[PDB]
């Protein structure tokens, strides 16, 4: 189980998901697939943003406007993902907003990075709007745009499926280091159940890529970095752009 994990590996075998883990895996996957804008066919049904909005330095009002106008639906799908996870529900109100505010940008940026399109060198926001590096940058994200784009390009080789993306989200969600958490121990035990099932799913997947698990975990910290760096970007925006231009849900998640 969680203990018999050493010998098994120490002899050279890689345990695949136990039956209990297979259920957790299906729960997390369904939760993700059901709340991910579009699905399978997300890329023929997407519109590029006119090459003039991104103004191809103050934040470009037009881009910021187009981006903030569709941010509420994005945040909402993240809360929805969390709600479909039994472990999340087993936590106190106080802790739940904490976890959500903490992983929101981490998960959202993962969802747009995983949909990087190398042909047109674009990322797609909310499954509809496809933007370029500069557009997203000038829209208000600054270097965050570069971070997500670089993550996206690197992720191409990982060939992640819905389950792997879902498990990543689950690991980001259950972060017991968020300041102000009450149930630090319980939340850490949950992230452990996810990481254990995740690693096992990876052994079952058999990616023809060396040290997949470790490299994959490094992406975790990058997403955490993208989030922390976005919070700063948020302060840079609250000092230029006016409040009226900040969707109420967008304001409560990041401040």
CA dist., res. 246 & res. 103, Å (int): 19
Q: Quick one: 144 or 166, whose CB is closer to ligand [As]? A: 144
* Minimal distance, residue 220 CB to ligand [As], in Å: 16
Edge-first strand listing for the sheet containing 47-48: 47-48, 129-131, 123-125
Cα–chain center distance at 58: 27
Q: Quick one: 91 or 136, whose CB is closer to ligand 4HY? A: 136
Task: Point out which span in 47-55, 91-99, 132-140, 246-254 binds ligand [As] (CB under 6 A).
Answer: 91-99
* Minimal distance, residue 93 CB to ligand 4HY, in Å: 24
* Binding-site partner at residue 109 among ligand 4HY, ligand [As], none, CB < 5 to 8 Å by type: ligand 4HY
Contact criterion met (CB below 8 Å) for 28 and 85: yes
Residue 89 interacts with ligand [As] (CB under 6 A): yes or no: yes
Q: What is the 3-state secondary structure (H, E, C) of 53-74?
A: CCCCCCCCHHHHHHHHCCHHHH
Q: Which helix (H) or strand (E) holds 150?
A: helix 143-155
- CA count, 13 A, side-chain hemisphere, 9: 11
CA dist., res. 55 & res. 139, Å (int): 9
Interaction residues for ligand [As], span 106-165 (CB under 6 A): 143, 147
Interaction residues for ligand 4HY, span 105-144 (CB under 6 A): 108-109, 111-112, 125-126, 139-141
Report the Cα–Cα distance between both ends of the chain, in Å, rounded.
41
Q: Quick one: 133 or 200, whose CB is closer to ligand 4HY? A: 133
* Minimal distance, residue 152 CB to ligand [As], in Å: 15
Phi, psi of 117 (to 5 degrees): -120, 95
Binding-site positions for L-thyroxine: 77, 126, 230
Residues making contact with ligand [As] (CB under 6 A): 83, 89, 93-94, 97, 143, 147, 183, 186, 229, 232
Residues making contact with ligand 4HY (CB under 6 A): 37, 64, 67, 70-71, 74, 108-109, 111-112, 125-126, 139-141, 148
């Amino acid at each position: 189980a969680s203990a018999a994990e050493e010998l098994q590996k120490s002899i050279g075998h890689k345990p695949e998901p136990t039956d209990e883990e297979w259920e957790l895996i299906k729960t997390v996957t369904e939760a993700h697939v059901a709340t991910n804008a579009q699905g399978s066919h997300w890329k023929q049904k997407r519109k590029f943003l006119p090459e003039d909005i991104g103004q191809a330095g103050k934040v470009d009002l037009e881009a910021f406007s187009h981006f903030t106008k569709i941010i509420t639906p994005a945040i909402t799908r993240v809360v929805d993902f969390a709600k479909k996870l039994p472990m999340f529900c087993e936590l106190p109100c106080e802790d739940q907003i904490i976890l959500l505010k903490g992983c929101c940008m981490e998960i959202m940026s993962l969802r747009t990075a995983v949909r990087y399109e190398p042909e047109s060198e674009t990322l797609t926001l909310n499954g509809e709007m496809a933007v370029t590096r500069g557009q997203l940058k000038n829209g208000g994200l600054g270097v965050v745009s570069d971070a997500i784009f670089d993550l996206g390009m690197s992720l191409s080789s990982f060939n992640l499926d819905d389950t792997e993306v879902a498990l990543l989200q689950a690991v980001l969600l259950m972060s017991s280091d968020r300041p102000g958490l009450a149930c630090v121990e319980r939340i850490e035990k949950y992230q452990d159940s996810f990481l254990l099932a995740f690693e096992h799913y990876i052994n079952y997947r058999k990616h023809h890529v060396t040290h997949f698990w470790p490299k994959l975990l490094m992406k975790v910290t990058d997403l955490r970095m993208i989030g922390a760096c976005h919070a700063s970007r948020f302060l840079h925006m609250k000092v230029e752009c006016p409040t009226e231009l900040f969707p109420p849900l967008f304001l409560e998640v990041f401040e």
